[PDB]
């Protein structure tokens, strides 16, 4: 299992407990991974659970927008899957790669589209998200849109 | 005259999302107190406009008034919509917020969201039966307030 410090930091990131993050976050710890889950980093947790203050502190203290969990997901995947616009904005501003793919070749746009998140899709698009990229199954983000999120389909059309 | 120290502290805590201080100061008598110093926002207006979900939640569970209006006629839902807080808006509607309410200049939550260019909020309010034909004092609909270069909300509206 993780060290207690690392465990506490990961939990605090999930919880949005920024004062606890500030006390535990160093260059050695900032990108630790949850070895008893899916190897999320503190930024994956903060992004997935929409902890804006924590995301912001972490980005300013060496947190890696390129880090991948056990499934190849980067924190922008987490933010997009769960529709956290400001979080996604902060990640992209700090250089998150919009076209990154996980182990199944899902991009953040695949996630946003499947989860019916319009503004997120629009943001990813405005940032060069490729609506034509196919995941391992052969599906584009457009393919994954729920009929009928016709606005999303039109966006990706 | 100003608010008691306690109502001041309750309003501040709500604006800041300090749920522990809200617990401490929130009673049946204080929950809907007004910032007479400012524009008479209630704790819920503050929580809603500052996107403090945990405080919104607590306040609503403690008899906060979704119909309370500030000095300009706005209800907390106006605050949520003007600032693009989708979850907050959803929680308010879930707890009885009337979607079609208008402030003193007959601006509705949808007028707010439209003018602010908050796409998902517009869809949310419509998806919940918000009337796009409503006119404010100037004879403007929500559509009328949609900015140029914001082509996508127009079609939605």
């Amino acid at each position: 299992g993780n060290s207690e410090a690392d465990r506490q930091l990961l939990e605090a990131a999930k919880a949005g407990d920024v004062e606890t993050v500030k006390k535990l976050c160093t260059v050695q710890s900032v990108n630790c991974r949850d070895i008893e889950g899916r190897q999320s980093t503190p930024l994956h947790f903060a992004a997935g659970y929409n902890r804006v203050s924590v995301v912001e502190y972490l980005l300013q203290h060496g947190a890696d927008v390129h880090a991948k969990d056990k499934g190849g997901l980067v924190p922008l995947h987490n933010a997009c899957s769960y529709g956290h616009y400001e979080v996604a904005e902060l990640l992209v501003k700090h250089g998150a790669v919009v076209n990154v793919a996980d182990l199944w070749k899902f991009t953040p746009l695949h996630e946003a589209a499947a989860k019916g998140k319009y503004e997120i899709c629009k943001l990813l698009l405005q940032h060069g998200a490729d609506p034509t990229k196919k995941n391992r199954d052969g599906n584009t983000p457009l393919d994954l849109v729920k009929d009928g999120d016709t606005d999303i389909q039109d966006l990706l059309r | 005259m100003g608010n008691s120290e306690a109502d001041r502290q309750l309003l501040e805590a709500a604006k800041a999302g300090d749920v522990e201080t809200v617990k401490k100061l929130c009673t049946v008598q204080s929950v809907n107190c007004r910032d007479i110093e400012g524009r008479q926002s209630t704790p819920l207006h503050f929580a809603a406009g500052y996107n403090r979900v945990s405080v919104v939640e607590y306040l609503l569970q403690h008899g906060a008034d979704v119909h309370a209006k500030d000095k300009g006629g706005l209800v907390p839902l106006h605050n949520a919509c003007s600032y693009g807080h989708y979850e907050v808006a959803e929680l308010l509607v879930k707890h009885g917020a009337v979607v079609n309410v208008a402030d003193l200049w007959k601006f509705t939550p949808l007028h707010e969201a439209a003018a602010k260019g908050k796409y998902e909020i517009c869809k949310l309010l419509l998806q919940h039966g918000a009337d796009p034909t409503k006119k404010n004092r100037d004879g403007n609909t929500p559509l009328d307030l949609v900015k140029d270069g914001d082509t996508d909300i127009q079609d939605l509206l």
Partner: peptide, 12 residues
């Protein structure tokens, strides 16, 4: 199989 990332849509 592919699994959900850590997170959730709503804070509440």
């Amino acid at each position: 199989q592919r699994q959900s990332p850590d997170g959730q849509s709503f804070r509440s």
